[PDB]
């Protein structure tokens, strides 16, 4: 067997878009452009216009629900204490900075500056989001304060305070590592935590393409809008691409055909744009649902699902706002510095088999010990940590050894 003897704390970044840019298109004005004859001709085609408007409105509404599900998950708003004594830990990077415009933390400021971003057109418009950036920052700050001061208790019922080192001891006990591991190594854990969080900012700042996902959404939406605008100047098999020339240079009776051709072309382009927007919105909604699930399952509680939040044994997580998404900072436990030993399924003493309650049998060559399964800590074999079941014949890999009774010395001393 090979049991590690030392560990490393690591922090990993995760980015998930949760929203799009709400938009609407003036269905009649885009196709016609303030012309009575065009509107009269379009009145024949029916109710495509209302269909497109309803679809776009339905798309635009859902973004607010996406943001509401992702972020608005706390009944109240918590506050960080004025004095910060977290047993050696340092949260100055994630907590909001008072002496600063707005209230974004330094990492959030870096994220907002990194992302590169919008105009007025003929019939197009953009609706402002329901929640401003300050409100989202307040939500993230409330979640962060609640998880720092209370733990996971604020996601189930009333918030109950608890010292931070005790919370971290609980979270190690939740992955099969006892409390004394943290309680005897608090300073090293604090140093590794601080160093990892400090390195996160430099890792984000150095690589320019770190985001790579929130930017793609903006780029492709802008490309769709630009090509929709550019589609307006096309002959489409007509005499000219401008209605004024057709109306003036030519009389109506053989001009209705040109107008009809232009109407058909523009309606087709608008319909294709709407369909593409619908598909993209469905994809973004799926991503937002995943982000909300990760929020609820990792920020508000420790997760036992493998590789769901970070690579390693999950510990806890911190949300950070982004221009059109959220950023997670998963904290994980990763072992290191392993060395091998020799094992045995059971220990045969007094003609009976023994099995460990919690841990494995190991030996460094001559003397057998019981240890944990994620941190090499030997212990003398006694009756307290082993249970007996059956004889020695049934088990295959039994070995020859002895198990001590702590009661025997005291009983012999005091008859």
């Amino acid at each position: 067997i090979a049991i590690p003897t030392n560990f490393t704390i690591s922090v990993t970044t995760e980015i998930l878009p949760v929203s799009m840019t709400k938009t609407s298109v003036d269905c009649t004005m885009y196709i016609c452009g303030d012309s009575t004859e065009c509107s009269n001709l379009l009145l024949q085609y029916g109710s495509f216009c209302t269909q497109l408007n309803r679809a776009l409105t339905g798309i635009a509404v859902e973004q607010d629900k996406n943001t509401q599900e992702v972020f608005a998950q706390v009944k109240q708003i918590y506050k960080t204490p004025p004095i910060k004594d977290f047993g050696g830990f340092n949260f100055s990077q994630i907590l909001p900075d008072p002496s600063k415009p707005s209230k974004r933390s330094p990492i959030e400021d870096l994220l907002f500056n990194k992302v590169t971003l919008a105009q007025k057109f003929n019939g197009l418009t953009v609706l402002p989001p329901l929640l401003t950036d300050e409100m989202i920052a307040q939500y993230t700050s409330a979640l962060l304060a609640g998880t720092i001061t209370s733990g996971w208790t604020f996601g189930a019922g009333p918030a109950l305070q608890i010292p931070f080192p005790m919370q971290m001891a609980y979270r190690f006990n939740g992955i099969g590592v006892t409390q004394n591991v943290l309680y005897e190594n608090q300073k090293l854990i604090a140093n590794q935590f601080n160093s990892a969080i400090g390195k996160i900012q430099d890792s984000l700042s150095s690589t320019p393409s770190a985001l790579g996902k929130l930017q793609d959404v903006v780029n492709q939406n802008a490309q769709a809008l630009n090509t929709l605008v550019k589609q307006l100047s096309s002959n489409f098999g007509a005499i000219s691409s401008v209605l004024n020339d057709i109306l003036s240079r030519l009389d109506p009776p053989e001009a209705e055909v040109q107008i009809d051709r232009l109407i058909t072309g523009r309606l087709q382009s608008l319909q294709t744009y709407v369909t593409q927007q619908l598909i993209r919105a469905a994809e973004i909604r799926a991503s937002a649902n995943l982000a909300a699930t990760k929020m609820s399952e990792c920020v508000l509680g420790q997760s036992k699902r493998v590789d769901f939040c970070g690579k390693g044994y999950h510990l806890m997580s911190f949300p950070q706002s982004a221009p059109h998404g959220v950023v997670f900072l998963h904290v994980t436990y990763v072992p290191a510095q392993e060395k091998n030993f020799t094992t045995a399924p059971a220990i045969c003493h007094d003609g009976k088999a023994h099995f460990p309650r919690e841990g494995v049998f190991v030996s460094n060559g001559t003397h057998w010990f019981v240890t944990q399964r994620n941190f090499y800590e030997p212990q003398i074999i006694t009756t307290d940590n082993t249970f007996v079941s059956g004889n020695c014949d049934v088990v295959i890999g039994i070995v020859n050894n002895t198990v001590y009774d702590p009661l025997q010395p005291e009983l012999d001393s005091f008859k």
């Binding site: 607010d64 608005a72 706390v74 009944k75 109240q76 708003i77 918590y78 506050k79 204490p81 004594d85 047993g87 418009t125 609706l127 402002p128 989001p129 329901l130 929640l131 401003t132 409100m135 307040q138 939500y139 409330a142 001061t149 209370s150 918030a159 109950l160 305070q161 010292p163």
Partner: protein
Amino acid sequence: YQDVNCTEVPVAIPTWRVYSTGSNVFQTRAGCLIGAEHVNNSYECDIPIGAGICASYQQSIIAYTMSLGAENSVAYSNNS
């Protein structure tokens, strides 16, 4: 009125004259709301408007900034 720097509602266009250039005007990020009175308080969000503003019915119609929730603080001590 949507996304209009509404100094020109009467030009932009019976009983509509009551809601055109009324006694109450309040410019927001999403436009400006006619027929609602601004309030310095903050409650939960009824019928939304945009940019963190929700109109409601108290009577009269009031426009106010949204309130996220009740403020709270937990007494955190290193041995409690």
